[PDB]
Design a protein around this ligand. Structure first.
Ligand SMILES: *[B]([O])([O])[C]([C][C]([C])[C])[N]C(=O)[C]([C]C1=[C][C]=[C][C]=[C]1)[N]C(=O)C1=[C]N=[C][C]=N1
Ligand SMILES: [Mg+2]
Lengths: 244, 240, 222, 204, 235, 212, 231, 195, 233
């Protein structure tokens, strides 16, 4: 019957590893590098678009940075189509919580929910896992500014600074070197761009090959503003930091 | 629905999927449990390969199931959340119907039953997780410490360890733990738990987590400095 | 509007002796003011030395007896031909009745036989399954006519010993099978006189350690 | 017994020259018992304003529901929903409960951000759209509001004049209804400024 | 791969035969039936000295008149015990009586072959079901994952089963007392066990008509062990 | 129906009548309205006979399963809540039940729970349930103390049922007495009202209204 | 070989190996004999024990007052099929007030076993059955194979060494068919028939199992000292 | 059941609930506590149809306690009240609706403010300085309208509450056997044992 | 739950020494309108059973189809379908009785009253009743609707108890049935003159008589009846 053709996506290897999860992580390692850096007064999200074209309409394009709600955003690394499935689920979960409790969802709760969905695909259903790794950048009134990451296994962890996708080993070493606890957003912006500029496989880092975003309390009085950077605004911050 | 039998017997009478789930536990960070005369202590290893971590928000290794029971684990982290969630739901369900919190044995029996169910259900793989469940029964001052594993078997332990290099720390506990006279105080019990982890951990900095559970829902997690004082005193006595 | 219930009249009577038990019932079957049948058996041998009757709505009565007879059959299959005791049969019938708690079998059920010590036994049920072991019970249309007579003549209620004047009760001496059958016949003859749904014939099933015997007697056909 | 008149209340909306106005009373009651004098019935999602009369539990539920839907709209569309589009969303959402409806009387008001055109609309409990040029009324004193609006209203009123007209329409209608009153709020809406005014009225 | 419900060329179900191998790896359990009662005994087999042995529960009560011992993948037995307890109590509810030991065993064995592609595999545990009823008196059954059950005068299952069965072959007779049966289980357990038999690594239990099913205390078993040592040294 | 139960120094007293009626017709005078759930638990029966019988013997099965699974006697609180949660599932369907779940455990002491087909579950010291509950309450409330002897408490319960048997048309037949202590319940006989009334009247000097 | 992984696969020569492997389980089972006359029908079954402490596995199952069978192979599969027969016999009685015909009982078993041979996931039954009964057309004997094939016979035998008993019955055909109104002699012939399949072991009091049904004889099973008469 | 009151003062929320339980013609109990602690700083009183009240209260209690354990964090009174409202709003269009009215009194530790919410069985939520369910409000709201002041102390709140209970005992036909009073403030929940 | 629309009236029957007789008129009424005048309400099953049906005609036609289908099904894999394993009256009845009680239990009844008349394999007379409620009973005489009130009294004068059956011949029994049909025509406002009669004898088999009429009617005395009391002309 049909058993003959079943790949069995949710089994252990003799070493106690999940085949499909490991192979999904291998896929993600070829995706464009995404970086998240958390500062005292905000969070930075920086990401590299993969080998673009001059004929790509950049100003209406979005492959890396997505908005989950007004307080929380994510950077993507892996299959974009897979990520959008999860992103729409996450957007709904945040709205369910808001409807139930009349309060914005705490960042960790949203992260745990998406991470639990990913876990399910590794334990039951016989389906392939989502080939996606997220960097969550968000704010709430309990823990303040927070950075998380999740991967196809459904495991998630918190970070001060973190990278996903390609060249994470090199990127993480550079972040570990220059990161300090009393750092500010403007400094973190510079660190994020400098790290991408050194780890990139491209010849030079330009505005058309980047997506950038900040989450600042730099909003008029006690509140939080999300800023998805425009192409011209990425070009300006590249000149300001002295990369172009 | 996906009905495929993933956990099945082999010619030599082994269920490889359950056995490979134990290998995932072997890979996981070390966890240890020691019960004294009037307390239980849960020690856990944090691998220092991950720095630049945010320890405020990172999921802690020891999880409260109820105000009087805790659960630590070794193995797949994502899998452990599912068992913890089910256990927490069952704990509140027990309070709701029986009008009494769960006994540590009951909660262990439930978690163990879930693990077993995943070894002979279609379309699912076993949990790659072993747990240490510790606490005190309601209105009882006798310490309780139980262990579970992917197959679904469970049992009570005077002291026990699970995870990577658990063979070494179990060796330590077997010679150092006396049944006729267990750690009489909190200090003695914590000291013995930190000592056992120091056989395996590497550095005694942010790599050791300790959680003390006392009777009547008295649970507290020790800080870095408090643990560091135990690490200092142990090695100074060792220099002799 | 459709009414799923009807009333087929009739009356039944169970009496437990010291080492025997009887279950009697008239053979008339009716709707409204018409006679359907002058001889329609109502008390049934269900095997394992148990007799049963479900009086009231005959369709529900037949359905229940049919299902209990079935339960006896499967009890033998599932438990190595073990004899179904009267107490076990009673509890089983409770579950059959309560299983239709919200659309009841519209019947008054009585079973009779011997208990495990060999003594006579009668059990009585309401439509939704409540039951109780009794020494004496009449059921159905003329139950209100017969029960008081049985309180008086079987349990010697309101009877005392001459000379003492209300001080000493009449002693509860046991009744033979010949004495019980006399009381059954008189009960039904009296019921036939004053209740229009009772008559035609009387069929009695007697249960002893030897088995199940039958006796039939003519009743007034008006 | 009648769900639409247990809690009581009213909403009214009007168009003016380059502006719209929406107003409501503040009462929530349990039949004859007055419970709350702070129960506002006007909500807003971006620049689109929604007033809802009727059963209060449904008023709350629908607000939470449209907040839910307009937030997802904005994330996907990358722009705020417009009054014309929102009107269709309300109609769709109400009709899906055709044979188990929310017992409400919604009213949409706002200015289209692109065309600048003033827009108002009303609905019945099951979705039917009433898109009037002049004014929309809703609630337990809808008859009273119709009478006030039909006599007081004139087209092309300036914002500060429109405020007086709508305020007098609400106040005098509420005072002829037992289940309306206990305070009132008026929103004056222009293309890029919105003023909110609480009215002093009789508290019986 | 291959079907879970597949027959081998010899006419045996692969999965059932493989589960029997898992049972051979399990700890020893012995049952002996007499006219005065039925005795059940097990090897606890703790993996480490730090493991509190009294928490090892390989002898289990199903009802007041039925007990049960297990051998193999003991986690698999929990749902079987739950079903047995439910069946026993349910029958009492429906029929106002105790359930026959054979009927209880049959109910448990009906679960056995409910596997396919229902549960994903057979049970990896064998059971010794001992009890008493009025019809057939004191009884001992051996319930396998094949769905088959045999009644026994005496039976051993687990790792030391064929050695123990041969010993039971010689020792059992129809006039055995309860005391004689208790000592006989202890004798045979001590013979096949790896570690030295004591009250902490071995457990006794019995079922009588009067007192019902009872798990023995460690103090009570310790005396029977001491009584055994002396009578073996007596000749 | 008249059933009562009350806590006191010597444990719990449970007393019930025996009558069952269908309209004005007296269907039975020998009804067992107390149920022996186990050697430590008792349940009283008022309202629908079948509902009470069926679900209380069912309750005994659930209690037996609990102590098989948990190796421990079920608490009165847990036993009562199993029954109250069950009837709550059937709420609206038409079940008719008024019951007391009476018992003693080490952790609770003597405990009584009123459980009812509307879903009501109440812990308390004194309860009277049934058509003749008001008559029983009169005698109980005026004579109740915590410091009653087992002998005196038993009589008070017997007397309170008698009071209701007399006045309430739908109560009567006979009185069943139970006494629940540290070591379980103890049955204290069937007392026919036809003999008990005249005995109490003569000895107690009560019921001077009636002629004898 | 490559075509025996499941029941849904024909081999190149048109064989169903999983069905054939199920047939093999019957040959491993203990011997049982069936025979009939015009008035009575008899089942004789050699019960098998695990060892000397064990009991002798029961081989005969009652389905109705007028019908029953003996089994050889997987006993749990016989329980499933006998339970199905019990239900079908019972449906016929409750709905139609009609005792189920033995021939129609065979047709129902055939169709139940067949579905398991044509569908993926399931498996064939691993047991063979000998059904005896007395209905409106007199005494009957059927032989059931888990391939689905059901056959009405005067006499037969299935299980290990069943060929010896089957040959004896083939010789005795003209004699035992005429044994009318004599149950003891018909059983004698059945006991003598099963004896042709014995090696090493002989028929003891707890070894032998006999069942009979006839004109004025309900289906009854004889075990223990009740069969000592025929040893 | 019958009477449940609530009043929010400067630094606390006070809930008063009747002790009587009546089934038909008899008062079966005169010491019943018509409240459940949802979290250390949140208390819910309830009144409605028999059985439904307790079943609903304990069901809510279990859900909030589950949240507290999962997140190791106490939900705000506003958040708890919204969860409760949604359950009742869901319930009203069910096969058999929960016939329960509630008051939720809580102290928000973040804002350092007491909060009182009134929710009926339809799922109608309102935040109030003082509230009541059933016929209680018909007597007590006039007194509270006069006497209430937003900055009363807890002692002043209890005195104003005594004036409400005295009026109820004078003019209501039903004997509700007095009230159990509970205070919710920064330090948690406590019961006034003499009232 | 429904209401009957097109309806059939009385079915009458009785036992005699060697068999059973059954009869029913050929009318299908639509309320007070005598709509359909050619409706056969006796339906034979094999050569040993006749099922007489009263009540709703649409439900009768459904039952007719069930019986037709029952014969077909019984023949399947049945070499003795026309012999030892043929359909008995008792089998046919029990089947219908099962269906009737099942349908009343789903609150969607077949709105009929049915009499199954026939002779068994051993020659025994079979006569049993079943209706929309699933109520069943047997008697030497059976009748539905108005027949119960008017026919039974007349037929019970011939066979009053079981012992009167051997003493009753086929000629005497048929005479009683035909008279009863006449009486029903006099007194039942939803009856017709035309009817069908069926005899099932253990010797001569099934005799099915169609197009029978009520004859020998007394009406002449009507001419003398004038007014309602005092009127003379
Ligand atoms: B008691 O009066 O509530 C009594 C207790 C019951 C357990 C036997 N109930 C009844 O007698 C009821 C009728 C009733 C009378 C008054 C109040 C409530 C109910 N009778 C029955 O349930 C019943 C059962 N079988 C036959 C006749 N009546
Ligand atoms: Mg009469």
């Amino acid at each position: 019957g049909s058993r003959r053709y079943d790949s069995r996506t949710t089994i252990f290897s003799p070493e106690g590893r999940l085949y499909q999860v490991e192979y999904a992580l291998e896929s993600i390692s070829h995706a464009g590098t995404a970086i998240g850096i958390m500062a005292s007064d905000g969070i930075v999200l920086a990401a590299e678009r993969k080998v673009t074209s001059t004929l790509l309409e950049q100003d209406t394009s979005t492959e890396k940075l997505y908005k989950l709600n007004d307080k929380i955003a994510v950077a993507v690394a892996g299959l974009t189509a897979d990520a959008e499935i999860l992103i729409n689920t996450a957007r709904i979960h945040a709205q369910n919580y808001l409807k139930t409790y009349n309060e914005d969802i705490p960042v960790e709760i949203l992260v745990r929910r998406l991470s639990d969905i990913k876990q399910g695909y590794t334990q039951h259903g016989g389906l392939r896992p989502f080939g996606v790794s997220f960097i969550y950048a968000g704010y709430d009134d309990r823990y303040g500014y927070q950075l998380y990451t999740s991967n196809p296994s459904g495991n998630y962890t918190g970070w001060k600074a973190i990278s996903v996708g390609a060249n994470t080993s090199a990127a993480q070493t550079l972040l570990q070197m220059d990161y300090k606890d009393d750092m500010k957003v403007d400094d973190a912006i510079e660190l994020a761009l400098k790290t991408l500029s050194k780890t990139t496989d491209s010849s030079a880092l330009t505005y058309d090959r980047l997506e950038f975003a900040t989450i600042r309390k730099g909003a008029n009085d006690g509140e939080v503003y999300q800023k998805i950077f425009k192409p011209q605004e990425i070009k300006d911050i590249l000149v300001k930091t002295g990369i172009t | 629905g996906y009905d495929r039998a993933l956990s099945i017997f082999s010619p030599d009478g082994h269920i490889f999927q359950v056995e490979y789930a134990l290998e995932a536990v072997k890979r996981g960070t070390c966890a240890v449990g020691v019960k004294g005369k009037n307390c239980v202590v849960l020690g856990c290893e944090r691998r220092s390969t991950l720095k630049l971590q945010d320890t405020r928000i990172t999921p802690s290794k020891v999880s409260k199931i109820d105000s009087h029971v805790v659960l630590s684990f070794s193995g797949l982290n994502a899998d452990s959340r599912i068992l913890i969630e089910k256990a927490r739901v069952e704990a509140q369900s027990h309070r709701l119907t029986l009008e009494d919190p769960v006994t540590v044995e009951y909660l262990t029996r439930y978690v163990a039953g879930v693990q077993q169910r995943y070894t002979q259900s279609g379309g699912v793989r076993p949990f790659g997780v072993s747990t240490l469940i510790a606490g005190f029964d309601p209105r009882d001052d006798e310490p309780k410490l139980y262990q579970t594993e992917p197959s679904g078997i469970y049992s009570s332990w005077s002291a026990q360890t699970i995870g990577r290099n658990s063979k070494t720390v179990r060796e330590f506990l077997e010679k150092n733990y006396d049944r006729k006279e267990p750690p009489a105080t909190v200090e003695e019990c914590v000291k013995l738990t930190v000592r056992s982890l120091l056989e395996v951990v590497q550095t005694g900095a942010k790599n050791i987590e300790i959680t003390v559970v006392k009777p009547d829902s008295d649970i507290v997690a020790l800080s870095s400095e408090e643990i560091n004082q135990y690490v200092t005193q142990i090695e100074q006595e060792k220099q002799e | 509007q459709f009414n799923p219930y009807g009333d087929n009249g009739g009356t039944i009577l169970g009496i437990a002796g010291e080492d025997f038990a009887v279950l009697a019932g008239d053979t008339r079957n009716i709707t409204d003011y018409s006679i359907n049948s002058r001889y329609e058996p109502k008390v049934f041998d269900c095997g394992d030395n148990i007799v049963m009757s479900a009086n009231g709505f005959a369709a529900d009565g037949d359905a229940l007896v049919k299902r209990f007879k079935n339960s006896v059959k499967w009890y033998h299959f599932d438990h190595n031909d073990k004899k179904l005791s009267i107490n076990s049969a009673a509890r089983n019938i409770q579950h059959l009745l309560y299983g239709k708690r919200f659309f009841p079998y519209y019947v008054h059920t009585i079973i009779a036989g011997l208990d495990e010590d060999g003594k006579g036994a009668v059990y009585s049920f309401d439509p939704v399954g409540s039951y109780e072991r009794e020494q004496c019970r009449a059921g159905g249309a003329a139950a209100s006519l017969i029960m008081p007579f049985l309180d008086n003549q079987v349990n010697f209620k309101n009877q005392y010993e001459p000379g003492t004047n209300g001080k000493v009760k009449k002693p509860l001496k046991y009744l033979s099978v010949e004495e019980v059958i006399k009381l059954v016949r008189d009960s039904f003859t009296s019921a036939t006189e004053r209740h229009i749904q009772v008559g035609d014939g009387l069929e009695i099933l007697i249960v002893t350690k030897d088995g199940v015997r039958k006796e039939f007697y003519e009743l007034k056909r008006d | 017994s009648d769900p639409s008149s247990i809690n009581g209340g009213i909403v009214v909306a009007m168009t003016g020259k380059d502006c719209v106005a929406i107003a409501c009373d503040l009462r929530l009651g349990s039949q004859s018992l007055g419970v709350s004098n702070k129960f506002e019935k006007i909500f807003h999602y971006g620049h689109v304003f929604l007033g809802i009369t009727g059963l209060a539990t449904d008023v709350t539920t629908l607000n939470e529901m449209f907040r839910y839907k307009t937030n997802l709209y904005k994330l996907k569309e990358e722009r705020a929903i417009e009054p014309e589009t929102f009107t269709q969303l309300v109609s769709s959402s109400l009709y899906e409960r055709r044979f188990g409806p929310y017992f409400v009387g919604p009213v949409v008001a706002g200015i289209n951000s692109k065309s600048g055109k003033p827009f108002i609309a009303g609905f019945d409990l099951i979705g039917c759209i009433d898109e009037a040029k002049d004014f929309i009324v809703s609630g337990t004193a809808s008859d009273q509001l119709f009478g006030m609006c039909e006599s007081l209203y004139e087209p092309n009123l300036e914002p500060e004049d429109l405020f007086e007209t709508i305020s007098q329409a609400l106040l005098n209608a509420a005072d002829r209804d037992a289940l309306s009153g206990w305070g009132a709020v008026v929103y004056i809406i222009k293309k890029d400024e919105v003023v909110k005014r609480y009215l002093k009225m009789r508290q019986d | 791969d291959r079907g879970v419900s597949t027959f081998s060329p010899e006419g045996r179900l692969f999965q059932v035969e493989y589960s029997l191998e898992a049972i051979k790896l399990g700890s020893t359990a012995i049952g002996i039936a007499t006219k005065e009662g039925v005795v059940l005994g097990v090897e606890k087999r703790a993996t480490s000295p730090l493991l509190e042995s009294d928490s090892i529960e390989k002898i289990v009560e199903i009802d007041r008149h039925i007990g049960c011992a297990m051998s193999g993948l003991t986690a698999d037995a929990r749902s079987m015990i739950e079903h047995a307890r439910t069946a026993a109590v349910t029958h009492n509810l429906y029929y106002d009586e105790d359930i026959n030991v054979e009927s209880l065993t049959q109910s448990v064995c009906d679960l056995a072959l409910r596997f396919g592609e229902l549960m994903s595999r057979p049970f990896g545990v064998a059971l010794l079901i001992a009890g008493h009823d009025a019809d057939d008196g004191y009884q001992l059954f051996h319930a396998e994952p094949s769905g088959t059950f045999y009644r026994y005068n005496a039976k051993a299952i687990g790792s030391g089963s064929e050695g123990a069965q041969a010993e039971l072959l010689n020792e059992w007779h129809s006039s055995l007392t309860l005391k004689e049966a208790e000592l006989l289980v202890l004798k045979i357990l001590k013979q096949v066990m790896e570690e030295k038999l004591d009250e902490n690594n071995a457990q006794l239990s019995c079922i009588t008509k009067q007192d019902g099913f009872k798990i023995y205390d460690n103090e009570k078993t310790a005396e029977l062990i001491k009584e055994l040592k002396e009578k073996e040294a007596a000749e | 129906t008249t059933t009562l139960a009350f806590r006191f120094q010597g444990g719990i007293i449970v007393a019930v009548d025996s009558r069952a009626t269908a309209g004005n017709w007296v269907a039975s005078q020998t009804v067992k309205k107390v149920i022996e759930i186990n050697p430590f638990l008792l349940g009283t029966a008022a309202g629908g006979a079948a509902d009470c019988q069926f679900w209380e013997t069912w309750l005994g099965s659930q209690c037996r399963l609990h102590e098989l699974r948990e190796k421990e006697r079920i608490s009165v609180a847990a036993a009562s809540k199993i029954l109250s949660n069950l009837v709550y599932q059937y709420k609206g369907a038409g079940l008719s039940m008024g019951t007391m779940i009476c018992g003693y455990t080490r952790k609770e002491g003597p405990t009584i729970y009123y459980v009812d087909s509307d879903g009501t579950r109440l812990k308390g010291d004194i309860f009277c349930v049934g058509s003749g509950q008001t008559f029983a309450y009169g005698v109980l409330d005026s004579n109740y103390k915590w410091d009653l002897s087992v002998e005196d408490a038993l009589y008070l319960g017997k007397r309170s049922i008698l009071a209701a048997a007399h006045r309430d048309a739908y109560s009567g037949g006979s009185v069943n007495l139970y006494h629940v202590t540290e070591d379980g319940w103890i049955y204290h006989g069937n007392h026919d009202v036809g003999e008990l009334f005249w005995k109490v009247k003569e000895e107690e000097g009560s019921f001077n209204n009636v002629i004898g | 070989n490559n075509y025996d992984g499941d029941t849904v696969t024909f081999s190149p020569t048109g064989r169903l190996f999983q069905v054939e492997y199920a047939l093999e389980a019957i040959k491993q089972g203990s011997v049982t004999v069936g025979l009939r006359s015009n008035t009575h029908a008899v089942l004789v079954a050699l019960k098998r024990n695990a060892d000397e402490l064990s009991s002798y596995q029961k081989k005969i199952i009652k389905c109705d007052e007028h019908m029953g069978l003996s089994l050889a192979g997987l006993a749990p599969d016989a329980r499933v099929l006998s339970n199905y027969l019990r239900q079908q016999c019972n449906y016929s009685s409750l709905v139609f007030n009609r005792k189920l015909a033995v021939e129609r009982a065979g047709h129902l078993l055939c169709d139940k076993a067949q579905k398991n041979t044509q569908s993926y996931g399931g498996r064939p039954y691993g047991v063979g059955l000998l059904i005896i009964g007395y209905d409106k057309s007199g005494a009957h004997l059927l032989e059931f194979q888990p391939s689905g094939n059901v056959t009405e016979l005067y006499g037969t035998a299935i299980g290990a060494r069943s060929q010896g008993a089957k040959t004896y019955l083939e010789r005795t055909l003209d004699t035992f068919i005429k044994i009318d109104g004599n149950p003891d002699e018909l059983i004698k012939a059945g006991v003598e028939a099963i004896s042709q399949s014995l090696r090493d072991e002989s028929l003891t009091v707890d070894n032998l199992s006999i069942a009979i049904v006839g004109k004025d004889t309900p289906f009854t099973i004889y075990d223990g000292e009740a069969v000592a008469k025929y040893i | 059941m019958d009477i449940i009151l609530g009043i929010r003062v400067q630094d606390s929320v006070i809930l008063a609930s009747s002790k009587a339980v009546t089934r038909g013609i008899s008062v079966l109990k005169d010491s019943d506590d018509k409240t459940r602690q949802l979290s250390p700083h949140t208390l819910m009183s309830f009144a409605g149809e028999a059985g439904d009240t307790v079943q609903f209260a304990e069901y809510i209690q279990a859900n909030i306690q589950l949240y507290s354990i999962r997140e190791d964090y106490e939900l705000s009174p506003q958040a708890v009240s919204s969860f409760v409202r949604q359950e009742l709003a869901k319930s009203i269009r069910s096969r058999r609706p929960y016939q329960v009215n509630v008051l939720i009194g809580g102290y928000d530790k973040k804002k350092n403010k007491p909060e009182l919410y009134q929710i009926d069985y339809l799922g109608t939520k309102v935040e109030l300085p003082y509230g009541a369910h059933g016929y209680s409000g018909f007597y007590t709201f006039s007194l509270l309208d006069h006497h209430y002041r937003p900055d009363m102390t807890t002692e002043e709140g209890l005195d104003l509450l005594k004036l409400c209970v005295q009026e109820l005992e004078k003019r209501m036909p039903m004997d509700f056997k007095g009230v159990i009073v509970k205070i919710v403030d920064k330090d948690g929940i406590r019961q006034v044992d003499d009232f | 739950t429904q209401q009957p629309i097109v309806t059939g009236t009385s079915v009458i029957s009785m036992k005699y020494d060697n068999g059973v007789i059954i009869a029913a008129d050929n009318l299908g009424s639509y309320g007070s309108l005598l709509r359909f005048n050619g409706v056969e309400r006796l339906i034979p099953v094999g050569d040993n059973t006749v099922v007489g049906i009263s009540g709703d005609i649409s439900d009768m036609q459904h039952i007719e189809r069930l019986l037709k289908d029952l014969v077909t099904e019984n023949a399947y894999d049945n070499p003795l379908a026309d012999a030892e394993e043929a359909l008995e009256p008792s089998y046919i009845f029990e089947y219908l009785a099962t269906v009737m009680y099942q349908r009343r239990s789903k609150m969607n009844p077949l709105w009929n009253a049915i009499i199954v008349a026939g002779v068994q394999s051993n020659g025994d007379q079979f006569l049993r009743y079943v209706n929309l409620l699933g109520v069943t009973y047997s008697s030497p005489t059976l009748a539905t609707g108005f027949g119960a009130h008017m026919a039974n009294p007349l037929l019970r004068k011939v066979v009053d108890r079981e012992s009167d059956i051997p003493k009753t011949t086929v000629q005497v029994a048929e005479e009683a049935i035909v008279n009863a049909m006449r009486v029903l025509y006099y007194r039942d406002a939803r009856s017709s003159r035309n009817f069908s009669l069926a005899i099932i004898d253990k010797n001569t088999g099934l005799t099915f008589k169609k197009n029978l009429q009520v004859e020998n009617m007394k009406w002449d005395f009507a001419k003398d009846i004038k007014g309602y009391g005092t009127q003379k002309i």
